[PDB]
């Protein structure tokens, strides 16, 4: 079961919904009139619409498409996006950006020709997110306490949303967070960032970490989690297993320059390939990737070394695919890909420090 | 000042977010490939997209291009939509539609050839949406006291949404119920549903309800207010007057049996052309139509039957364009009208009874 995938190669459909200080419509209307072309001229760009709402005059929209996902996700995080709408923030309030694939069309009253005839990915209301962040060379003991030690704050933000599961890693001065949420995944980190609990924690790590951020201003704040978010790019389950043992564990990926999205399709081919076909511990894969950094964060049945390559998702060639996108020696792993003394020492060093792992209902 | 125009005759962009039940994904893509030939054959309708959202498989959109806001307003309200769309409640868990006017389009790497030259509305962040029902002769009275002195709930829904002002009006055994709500009507309108003083007031309706009502069936409801809707059309914003008197008024025009869509358009170009060389007592006027049910809902500073042409936004030629879209024999106003004494009692035959005017904190 593959539930998420960036790699189909599906057309994307982008719903950008933007509330507008009240009476500054002409403004923002005049300071899309500005950025409009650097908008359109990005890579992968196709169509857009500006819309006003026939109920509320605050409400916009800004529906995209996109030629597939990994365009747009290469700018939708990207700091040339940051600074091509910053004149935007005098006049808009909030922001929600919705991405979804397309799997039919109508044009012409008549089913559109090239429609896909794709099949739905199946599964529960969960959306998967990471965060990464680095901090400073001598901080590393101080800021891994401070995140294994947090007040869990209240999983209930609505009917709608839920906080499911909170896991951090810790490997060198590099931080990995990711959750798993019911329903909304904006009004969940926005109700969880308001929790006494995490702000008190975020105020505690501010002064470590590398890149230096004001909680207090939204635009320091939206470009720290611009810069920081590792969207899930491959979402896999497979059938579980009657072991006494279960293990949660981050993999991070010593990638070689400009390699990072090419891991990425490579882990997630072989994750939909064993889902297919099952073989090995692994209970549920996810894809994290930004730039060069790709993690996968793996839940396994029994001692993860037991199975190094199918936890690695280098299983078959895959470990052969990727000798020429990893950098194993730079960690301190030689020895020919396939080798299972090979696969098991790049399993202990690529395998993140666990900090914390808190279950919510 | 105008706020709210669905006769700019701009087409529609419509988003509608559609949650499915885990699990029953292919089955709800298979119930719509077996629905989507009605859509297509909807007047007004011009494209269609399905998709699947990236981050989450029950999360789904269908994003359609329409002609104008007629086209759309006439279908989403219909019977036949709600009966097009009935065999998708199994794989379904909630909706939510939003309806937007193009403003600016990108087609090629290129301002579209045909896009809009239209300047924006400009707005304050308030959703303005009224409800029209009818009671059974003889249940009049009975009805005006539950609807004035039931139990007012939080206005309160969550910190992006709150219920601004709830005014209700009677005239025959017809009611008007208009809200404006700030940030997203739907959560708006479904916390209020939800809370006891209001349910109490609705279960002791239904006995009174000319139409039939089971709150008990979502569905039966949904039907309710799908037929009750009566949107808001046009919504202008008049500069703020000294004055010692402020009053709310609702006007519930007789239109000629033929049509009055002609009725709610007049109207609304007479209020934009006020909202534009302002001289009268009005502060604002929501225009609300639903087919020939047309109602203004003006705020006048001052006695409103010091000037009625304005009020009743038949000020210059209007209250003669409208000669002919108007009934006013029925409600017993016999005269010339862009004339005061006919003007006058026109303003008194159709101004609705205020039962309740709840305007909150916010």
Redesign the interface.
Known sequence: GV??S?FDGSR??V?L?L?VH??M??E??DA??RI?DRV??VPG?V???????????????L?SEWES?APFLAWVNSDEHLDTVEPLATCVRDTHS??????????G???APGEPRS???????????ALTFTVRPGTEAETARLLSEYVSPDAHVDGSTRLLRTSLFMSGNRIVRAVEVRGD?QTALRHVARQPGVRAVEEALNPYLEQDRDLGDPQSARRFFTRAAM??VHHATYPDRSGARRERLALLYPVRDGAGPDLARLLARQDAAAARNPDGPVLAATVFHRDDLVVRLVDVDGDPEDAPAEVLGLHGRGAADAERLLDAAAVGVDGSPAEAATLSRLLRRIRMTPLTDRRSA
């Open positions: 539930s998420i960036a994307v459909r719903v919904m509330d009240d009476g419509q002409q923002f209307l899309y009139e409009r359109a001229a760009h169509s857009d619409q500006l819309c006003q709402s026939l109920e509320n005059p605050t409400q916009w929209l529906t996902a919705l991405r979804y694939s397309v799997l039919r069309e109508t044009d009253g008549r089913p099949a739905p990915r199946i599964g529960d209301n969960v959306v998967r997110h995944l969207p899930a």
